[PDB]
Design a protein around this ligand. Structure first.
Ligand SMILES: [Ca+2]
Length: 300
């Protein structure tokens, strides 16, 4: 019954598993409908944690996802997990068990953060468990596994960034039902775009709605105290637009740039100009004149 599988969840919200041998076996212009938001290799009997925008976490075994192969869509996650109305996926984390890392750290749209012991989430309660108490106009945006020795990076849509060390002193572990503490401070005009764990030798790739992208080595993000305004990670220009993509990449990463007009461009991280934190980005190759960028996705 226990098999190795590839789990795929589309950006459109459909989930399936595929036996790894069949997946490999099943190896045209790219279509937005086929963009995969979450992809990993695991056991049928591993757990998948679905963190929602409303700050809940629903768990499922990988075998709870339907078998379908590479062409078929699978089941929509909101039906499979019985999400509340309007509830959407914010992040998905696959685990072998609740000791995979010491902590889960969550980050909210309005810049709040919280560390909780991962074992606090080991509950068979159905219908979703609260992972963070949100104010009425907040949403959960990020969730990562980490240890007290890690640094975290928060990036906002307007291009602020803050890096701080997730020590016990900086971020005391809190219960699931509690509210977050301030992670980055910004006004109503800004909102958090991404949360990531700092890893040596990687880059933060940012991209604006106007199609301008760059990647900056992670070592150029300065460590600061939690809760500040942070530092800029883009040279802002009215015409170039706000950020649409905040993500960590390495030299070998492959990405999909989702454009206006229903388009998708294959963009390797090696095509994206390595530059400084506040150096202007470079227009993505194969972006048509007048076309804009909606998102940056990963390619397996
Ligand atoms: Ca294309």
């Amino acid at each position: 019954n226990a098999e190795d599988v590839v789990v795929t969840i589309t950006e459109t919200g459909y989930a399936k598993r595929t036996k790894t041998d069949l997946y490999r076996s099943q190896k045209a212009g790219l279509k937005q409908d086929d963009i995969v938001a979450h992809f990993f290799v695991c056991s049928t009997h591993d757990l998948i944690l679905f963190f929602t925008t409303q700050g809940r976490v629903y768990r499922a075994k990988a075998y709870d996802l339907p078998e379908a192969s590479r062409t078929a869509r699978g089941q929509h996650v909101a039906n499979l997990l019985a999400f509340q109305p309007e509830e959407r996926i914010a992040q998905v984390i696959q685990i072998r068990g609740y000791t995979d890392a010491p902590y889960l750290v969550l980050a909210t749209r309005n810049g709040l953060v919280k560390k909780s012991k991962l074992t606090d989430f080991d509950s068979n309660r159905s219908g979703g468990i609260v992972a963070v108490n949100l104010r009425d106009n907040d949403e959960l945006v990020g969730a990562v596994l980490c240890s007290a020795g890690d640094d975290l990076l928060l990036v906002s849509a307007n291009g602020q960034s803050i890096r701080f060390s997730a020590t016990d002193e900086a971020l005391r572990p809190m219960g699931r039902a509690t509210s977050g503490v301030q992670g980055m401070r910004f006004n109503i005009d800004d909102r958090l775009l991404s949360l990531n764990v700092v890893r040596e030798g990687t880059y933060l790739l940012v991209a604006t709605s106007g199609g301008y992208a760059k990647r900056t080595a992670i070592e150029e993000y300065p460590v600061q105290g939690r809760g500040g305004k942070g530092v800029l990670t883009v040279m802002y220009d009215r015409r170039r637009g706000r950020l649409v993509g905040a993500l960590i990449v390495d030299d070998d990463s492959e990405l999909y740039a989702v454009t206006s007009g229903g388009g998708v461009i294959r963009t390797a991280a090696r095509q994206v100009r390595k530059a400084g934190r506040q150096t202007k980005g470079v227009r993505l190759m194969n972006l048509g004149e007048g076309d804009t960028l909606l998102a940056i996705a990963r390619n397996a």
